Amino acid sequence: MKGRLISSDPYRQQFLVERAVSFSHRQRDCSELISVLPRHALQQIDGFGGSFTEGAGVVFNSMSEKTKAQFLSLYFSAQEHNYTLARMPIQSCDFSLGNYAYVDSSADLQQGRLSFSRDEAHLIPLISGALRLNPHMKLMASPWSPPAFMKTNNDMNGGGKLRRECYADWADIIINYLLEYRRHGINVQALSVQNEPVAVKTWDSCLYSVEEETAFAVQYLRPRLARQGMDEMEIYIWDHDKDGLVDWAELAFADEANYKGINGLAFHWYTGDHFSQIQYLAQCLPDKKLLFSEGCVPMESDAGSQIRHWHTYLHDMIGNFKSGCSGFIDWNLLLNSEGGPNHQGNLCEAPIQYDAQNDVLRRNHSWYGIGHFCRYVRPGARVMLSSSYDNLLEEVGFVNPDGERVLVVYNRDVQERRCRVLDGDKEIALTLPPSGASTLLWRQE
Amino acid sequence: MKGRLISSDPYRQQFLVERAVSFSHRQRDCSELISVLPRHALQQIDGFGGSFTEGAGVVFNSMSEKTKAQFLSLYFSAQEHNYTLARMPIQSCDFSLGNYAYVDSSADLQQGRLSFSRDEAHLIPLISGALRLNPHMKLMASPWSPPAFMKTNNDMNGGGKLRRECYADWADIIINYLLEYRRHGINVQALSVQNEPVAVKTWDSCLYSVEEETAFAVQYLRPRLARQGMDEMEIYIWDHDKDGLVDWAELAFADEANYKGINGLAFHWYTGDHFSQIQYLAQCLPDKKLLFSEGCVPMESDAGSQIRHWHTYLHDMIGNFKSGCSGFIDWNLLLNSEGGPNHQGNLCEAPIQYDAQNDVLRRNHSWYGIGHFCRYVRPGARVMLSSSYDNLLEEVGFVNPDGERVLVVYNRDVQERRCRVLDGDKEIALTLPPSGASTLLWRQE
């Protein structure tokens, strides 16, 4: 039995180095093992990707044609990151030049006058470019806030709630958003009712109780989607941090109608690991999807910033998938050198950043970290059962649809560590430097 | 809502310090949380304990009468560790003065000439003393090796296997052992077919294929136990390290006869964490028990060795229970100053060691670590759902039969760490020093 080993040694700036390797008959000793049992498959995953925001779009539009091509190939080429998922905003989010909605007054609403010109200039070009490289990407759309006049606070920023008498109107706008994008060759396959429905932000935000969020999904979105023949659309709820996952799910799915009309829950990583809540729901709601929909790290200039970011991405991804996660979607795919533009000054790092002045593209550690997963695991693959002799050696494995085994191993220890990947009567000894990560690919004999 | 907090700092050696504490209404911020959901109960646990071996018995017998009482109280008093489980060997194990069997020729067995002199002299006195403090202890017996003449290698040591024509006779000896102990007021409630059935040791050992081990349990042990009115006896298989747990269970429980006659699997920690395998079985075999039956650390006198031992016990215990474990049984309860007696020089540390030179008893760090669990969690308790924002802050919670909530938290980080235990709309902020451990006790309002 043989395979391919892709190894990264961040402290030496060595990333995704591939080389041919071969397994050997296993030794009797059972120490330092990372046992893999490909025959025992767990949950199915839908893919990996990042987010298209007005900010990312504006930065993309500012790239030279040469850079645009390089950027798109790096992320969407089947020979590179092969991104298969994506998330985008319905109207403005903080990563926009400013607030914007598809309709700004009750009068324009009544007269049916909507405007998508802004998305057509800032978002669609980037999305269309990506779709050219991978026309089969599964796209998800989520709102940060309904138009100002449809809210109790008359402001897209600062929280507030959707006025009860505007539920139908907001749902109708979302349908037009979908029709608008379909006209430009962009098909959406998933939606979330609202980004962080329980959190007030100084930027675009809107609050919904669990009863309100689920009612909007089942009573308003579902019937309309069906009438448009968009029955297969997936709808996710929560779309917030992992600490409140179980509490929300419990309340939401207690109602049979919600269980039937909602596909699963989306979650973020801003409050930490909380992997146990993903696992509990994976066991209680085996037929629902638990999607990681957003995460990012701040801009930091100290010596250890890149290594810390590397850890944050790998640690959360491995834990999520080992716990029942159905997919991974990073936040902004791209941002400028300072981590913008953001209309509220909430600057953040993105795996790829671009400097327009010198027309220089930069790949941060996180880009390579995500790569240990996305470059090798395909949509439809299932996580496989595996175990590690030491929790500091983080690991998770998958079996692609074609049977290819894929194992990701990350050493969070501050020392070089060893392990023996054991698959039945075959094994391969690996040595990882501190913070090193390796992806092993192989097929049954 | 009030509670009790028991805190330990292994470096400063301030163990199990208790103080009254109070929860406060939760703050809106959701960072640094260890979320607990008592309403969601997981697996039930049977208790905590240690092992009685000839070695431990000899050391116990060597103590002064005052030290014997101190020792017994520390481990079995309801006001101390309150051990509720125990494991002991059927015939000799490595922690014995030497090899010994209850009979050594088919002729003597045939005529009922068995000898329990050594058990009566070295094991029964210790066991009886413990039973005096806790008459309801759940005792488990496991063999390391059948008599030499019943094996293919005619040696209790060095592996070999039970001769097929001796299955009935070995089973009878086991029954005789049970009747011998019963006549001495000692009732056994559980058995394992063989200690480490796939491992050859320089000391007492015996190999069994999974087919052989299960057949012995179902085809020979069960019938005999039933005819003696011991049908309630629990039988465990595997009784080895966690790395081969799923593989063995898969093969054993594929047969209906085995599923109906075997109560679960026992396991050790000698090859590392491998927590995922416990979790997988907890999901696939929800009605079977996954018991941790043995573990110990070697004698080590280098700097910080006590902290490492403290870590080993707490880390494995927390991981096991979070993953589906039904109980904890430590290896030798007591050993001499050097970590013996052991007839193969396999010296190990025990939570309590006795120095016969000056009649001094010493409690190692591991004793206190185990206490964070055993002094507060009662048999029949159920693990509760909980999650941590940072897995370096290891934690597991329980709900005792009387409703008391118990949360164990261990900080494996190298710096002081903070966390907010969140129970519904109530919280309590805790600060743990490096390697610190805390047990929080409380009841619902």
Coordinates of C-alpha atoms in Angstrom, one line a residue, chain A residues 121-440:
Chain A
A121 CA -20.7 45.9 -9.9
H122 CA -19.0 44.8 -6.7
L123 CA -20.1 41.2 -6.1
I124 CA -21.2 39.5 -9.3
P125 CA -17.9 39.9 -11.2
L126 CA -15.9 38.1 -8.5
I127 CA -18.5 35.3 -8.1
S128 CA -18.9 34.9 -11.8
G129 CA -15.1 34.6 -12.2
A130 CA -15.0 31.9 -9.5
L131 CA -18.0 30.0 -11.1
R132 CA -16.0 30.0 -14.4
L133 CA -13.3 27.9 -12.7
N134 CA -15.8 25.8 -10.8
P135 CA -19.4 26.0 -12.1
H136 CA -20.5 23.5 -9.6
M137 CA -19.8 25.5 -6.4
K138 CA -22.6 25.3 -3.8
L139 CA -23.5 28.9 -2.9
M140 CA -25.1 30.0 0.4
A141 CA -26.6 33.4 1.0
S142 CA -27.3 35.0 4.4
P143 CA -28.7 38.4 5.4
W144 CA -27.1 40.7 8.0
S145 CA -30.1 43.0 8.0
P146 CA -33.4 43.8 6.2
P147 CA -33.8 47.3 4.8
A148 CA -33.9 50.0 7.5
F149 CA -37.6 51.0 7.1
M150 CA -38.6 47.4 7.7
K151 CA -37.0 47.4 11.2
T152 CA -38.1 48.5 14.6
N153 CA -35.1 50.8 14.9
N154 CA -35.2 52.2 11.3
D155 CA -31.5 51.4 10.9
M156 CA -29.6 48.5 9.3
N157 CA -27.0 48.9 12.0
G158 CA -27.4 48.5 15.8
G159 CA -29.7 45.6 16.0
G160 CA -33.4 46.1 16.0
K161 CA -35.9 43.5 14.7
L162 CA -37.9 42.9 11.5
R163 CA -41.3 44.5 11.9
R164 CA -43.9 41.7 12.0
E165 CA -45.9 43.4 9.2
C166 CA -42.7 43.2 7.0
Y167 CA -42.1 39.4 7.2
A168 CA -43.8 38.8 3.8
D169 CA -42.1 41.8 2.2
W170 CA -38.6 40.8 3.4
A171 CA -39.2 37.2 2.2
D172 CA -40.3 38.6 -1.2
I173 CA -37.1 40.7 -1.4
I174 CA -35.0 37.6 -0.7
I175 CA -36.8 35.8 -3.5
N176 CA -36.0 38.7 -5.9
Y177 CA -32.4 38.5 -4.8
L178 CA -32.4 34.9 -5.8
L179 CA -34.1 35.6 -9.2
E180 CA -31.7 38.5 -9.8
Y181 CA -28.6 36.3 -9.2
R182 CA -30.1 33.5 -11.3
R183 CA -30.4 35.9 -14.2
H184 CA -26.7 36.5 -14.0
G185 CA -26.0 32.8 -14.0
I186 CA -25.6 32.5 -10.3
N187 CA -27.6 29.7 -8.6
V188 CA -27.9 29.6 -4.8
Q189 CA -28.4 26.3 -3.0
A190 CA -28.5 27.4 0.6
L191 CA -29.8 30.2 2.8
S192 CA -29.6 31.1 6.5
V193 CA -32.5 33.2 7.9
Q194 CA -30.2 35.7 9.6
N195 CA -26.6 36.1 10.5
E196 CA -26.2 36.0 14.3
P197 CA -29.9 36.5 15.1
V198 CA -29.3 37.1 18.8
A199 CA -26.4 39.6 18.5
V200 CA -26.6 43.4 18.2
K201 CA -23.7 44.8 16.3
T202 CA -22.6 48.4 15.6
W203 CA -22.8 47.2 12.0
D204 CA -25.5 45.4 10.0
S205 CA -27.5 43.2 12.3
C206 CA -31.1 42.1 13.2
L207 CA -32.5 40.2 16.1
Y208 CA -35.0 37.2 15.9
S209 CA -36.2 35.0 18.7
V210 CA -36.0 31.3 17.8
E211 CA -39.7 31.3 17.3
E212 CA -39.4 34.2 14.9
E213 CA -36.4 32.9 13.0
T214 CA -38.0 29.5 12.4
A215 CA -41.4 31.0 11.5
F216 CA -39.7 33.1 8.9
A217 CA -38.0 30.1 7.4
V218 CA -41.0 27.7 7.4
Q219 CA -44.0 30.1 7.1
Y220 CA -42.5 32.7 4.8
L221 CA -39.5 31.4 2.9
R222 CA -40.6 27.8 2.3
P223 CA -43.9 28.6 0.6
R224 CA -42.4 31.2 -1.7
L225 CA -39.4 29.1 -2.6
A226 CA -41.8 26.3 -3.5
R227 CA -43.9 28.5 -5.7
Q228 CA -40.7 29.5 -7.6
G229 CA -39.8 25.9 -8.0
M230 CA -36.8 26.3 -5.6
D231 CA -37.9 23.4 -3.5
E232 CA -34.5 21.9 -3.1
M233 CA -33.1 25.0 -1.4
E234 CA -31.5 24.2 2.0
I235 CA -32.3 26.5 4.9
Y236 CA -30.0 26.8 8.0
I237 CA -30.8 28.5 11.3
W238 CA -28.7 29.8 14.3
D239 CA -25.8 31.0 12.2
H240 CA -24.0 32.0 15.4
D241 CA -21.3 30.8 17.8
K242 CA -21.1 27.2 19.1
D243 CA -21.8 27.9 22.7
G244 CA -25.6 28.3 22.1
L245 CA -25.9 25.5 19.6
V246 CA -27.8 22.9 21.6
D247 CA -30.1 25.3 23.4
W248 CA -31.3 26.8 20.1
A249 CA -31.6 23.5 18.3
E250 CA -33.7 22.1 21.1
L251 CA -36.2 24.9 21.0
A252 CA -36.2 25.0 17.2
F253 CA -36.8 21.4 16.4
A254 CA -39.3 20.8 19.2
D255 CA -41.8 21.8 16.5
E256 CA -42.5 19.2 13.8
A257 CA -43.1 21.8 11.2
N258 CA -39.6 23.3 11.8
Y259 CA -38.0 19.8 11.8
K260 CA -39.5 19.2 8.3
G261 CA -38.7 22.6 6.8
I262 CA -35.2 23.3 8.1
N263 CA -32.1 21.4 6.9
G264 CA -29.8 22.2 9.8
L265 CA -27.8 24.7 11.7
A266 CA -24.9 26.9 10.7
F267 CA -22.3 28.0 13.3
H268 CA -19.3 30.3 13.8
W269 CA -16.2 30.0 16.1
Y270 CA -16.1 33.3 17.8
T271 CA -16.6 32.0 21.4
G272 CA -14.2 29.0 21.2
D273 CA -14.3 25.2 20.6
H274 CA -17.4 23.9 22.2
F275 CA -17.0 20.8 20.0
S276 CA -19.2 18.7 22.3
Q277 CA -22.3 20.6 21.3
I278 CA -21.7 19.7 17.6
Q279 CA -21.3 16.1 18.6
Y280 CA -24.4 16.0 20.7
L281 CA -26.5 17.4 17.9
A282 CA -24.8 15.0 15.4
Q283 CA -26.1 12.1 17.5
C284 CA -29.6 13.6 18.2
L285 CA -30.2 15.0 14.7
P286 CA -28.4 12.5 12.4
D287 CA -30.4 13.6 9.4
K288 CA -29.7 17.4 9.8
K289 CA -26.6 19.3 8.7
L290 CA -24.2 21.1 11.1
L291 CA -22.4 23.6 8.9
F292 CA -19.5 25.8 9.9
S293 CA -20.5 28.9 8.1
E294 CA -18.0 31.6 9.2
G295 CA -14.8 32.4 11.1
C296 CA -11.8 34.7 10.8
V297 CA -8.9 36.1 12.9
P298 CA -8.0 39.7 13.5
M299 CA -5.0 41.6 12.0
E300 CA -2.1 41.2 14.4
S301 CA 1.5 42.3 13.8
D302 CA 3.5 40.5 16.6
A303 CA 6.0 37.7 15.8
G304 CA 3.6 34.9 16.7
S305 CA 0.6 36.1 14.9
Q306 CA 0.8 33.9 11.8
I307 CA 1.4 30.8 13.9
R308 CA -1.5 31.6 16.2
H309 CA -3.8 32.1 13.1
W310 CA -2.5 28.8 11.7
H311 CA -3.5 27.1 14.9
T312 CA -6.9 28.7 15.1
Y313 CA -7.9 27.5 11.7
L314 CA -6.5 24.0 12.0
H315 CA -7.7 23.4 15.6
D316 CA -11.3 24.5 14.9
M317 CA -11.5 22.6 11.6
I318 CA -10.2 19.3 12.9
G319 CA -12.4 19.5 16.0
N320 CA -15.5 20.4 14.0
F321 CA -15.2 17.6 11.6
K322 CA -14.3 15.0 14.3
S323 CA -17.5 16.2 16.0
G324 CA -20.0 15.9 13.1
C325 CA -19.5 19.1 11.0
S326 CA -21.0 18.9 7.5
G327 CA -18.9 21.6 5.8
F328 CA -16.5 24.6 6.1
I329 CA -16.9 28.1 4.9
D330 CA -14.3 30.7 5.8
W331 CA -15.2 34.4 6.1
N332 CA -13.8 36.9 3.6
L333 CA -11.8 35.2 0.8
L334 CA -9.8 38.3 0.2
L335 CA -9.2 41.7 1.7
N336 CA -6.8 44.6 1.3
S337 CA -3.4 44.9 3.1
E338 CA -5.0 46.4 6.2
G339 CA -7.8 43.9 6.4
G340 CA -10.5 46.1 4.9
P341 CA -12.6 47.7 3.6
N342 CA -15.1 47.5 6.5
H343 CA -17.6 50.3 7.1
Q344 CA -17.3 50.0 10.8
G345 CA -13.6 49.7 11.1
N346 CA -13.8 46.0 12.0
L347 CA -10.6 45.0 10.1
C348 CA -9.8 41.3 9.9
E349 CA -7.2 39.1 8.2
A350 CA -8.2 37.0 5.2
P351 CA -6.3 34.0 3.9
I352 CA -5.3 36.1 0.9
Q353 CA -4.7 39.8 1.0
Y354 CA -3.9 42.2 -1.9
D355 CA -1.9 45.4 -2.1
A356 CA -3.2 47.5 -5.0
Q357 CA -0.4 50.0 -5.1
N358 CA 2.3 47.4 -5.9
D359 CA -0.2 44.9 -7.3
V360 CA 1.1 42.2 -4.9
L361 CA -0.9 39.2 -3.7
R362 CA -0.1 37.7 -0.3
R363 CA -1.0 34.3 1.1
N364 CA -1.2 34.0 4.9
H365 CA -0.6 30.9 7.0
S366 CA -4.3 30.3 7.2
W367 CA -4.5 29.8 3.4
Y368 CA -2.1 26.8 3.7
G369 CA -3.9 25.6 6.8
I370 CA -7.2 25.4 5.0
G371 CA -5.4 23.8 2.1
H372 CA -4.5 20.7 4.1
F373 CA -8.2 20.0 3.9
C374 CA -9.8 21.6 0.8
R375 CA -7.1 20.6 -1.8
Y376 CA -7.7 16.9 -1.1
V377 CA -11.2 16.3 0.4
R378 CA -14.1 16.4 -2.1
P379 CA -17.8 17.1 -1.7
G380 CA -19.7 14.0 -0.7
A381 CA -16.8 12.5 1.2
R382 CA -17.5 11.0 4.7
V383 CA -15.5 11.5 7.8
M384 CA -14.0 8.1 8.9
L385 CA -13.5 6.8 12.4
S386 CA -10.0 7.4 13.8
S387 CA -8.3 7.8 17.1
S388 CA -5.1 9.3 18.4
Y389 CA -2.8 8.2 21.2
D390 CA -2.3 11.8 22.2
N391 CA -4.8 14.7 21.9
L392 CA -2.0 17.1 21.2
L393 CA -1.6 15.3 17.9
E394 CA -4.9 16.5 16.4
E395 CA -6.3 14.5 13.6
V396 CA -9.4 13.7 11.4
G397 CA -9.8 11.5 8.4
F398 CA -12.1 11.3 5.4
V399 CA -13.0 8.8 2.7
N400 CA -13.7 10.5 -0.6
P401 CA -16.6 9.3 -2.9
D402 CA -14.0 7.4 -5.0
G403 CA -12.6 5.6 -2.0
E404 CA -9.5 7.6 -1.5
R405 CA -8.5 7.8 2.2
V406 CA -7.4 11.3 3.5
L407 CA -5.9 11.9 6.9
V408 CA -5.1 15.4 8.3
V409 CA -2.7 15.5 11.3
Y410 CA -1.7 18.7 13.2
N411 CA 0.9 18.7 16.0
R412 CA 0.0 21.5 18.4
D413 CA 2.9 20.5 20.8
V414 CA 5.9 22.8 21.0
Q415 CA 8.2 19.8 20.3
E416 CA 8.7 17.5 17.4
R417 CA 6.3 14.6 17.7
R418 CA 6.0 11.1 16.2
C419 CA 3.0 8.9 15.3
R420 CA 2.3 5.8 13.4
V421 CA -0.8 5.9 11.1
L422 CA -2.2 2.5 11.5
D423 CA -4.7 1.2 8.9
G424 CA -5.4 -2.5 9.5
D425 CA -2.2 -4.5 9.2
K426 CA -0.4 -1.6 7.5
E427 CA 1.3 1.4 9.0
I428 CA 3.4 4.5 8.1
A429 CA 5.6 6.3 10.7
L430 CA 5.4 10.1 10.6
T431 CA 7.4 12.8 12.4
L432 CA 5.9 16.3 12.6
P433 CA 7.8 19.4 13.7
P434 CA 6.2 21.8 16.3
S435 CA 3.0 23.2 14.8
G436 CA 3.5 21.0 11.7
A437 CA 0.6 19.7 9.7
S438 CA 0.5 16.8 7.3
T439 CA -2.2 15.3 5.0
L440 CA -1.8 11.7 4.0

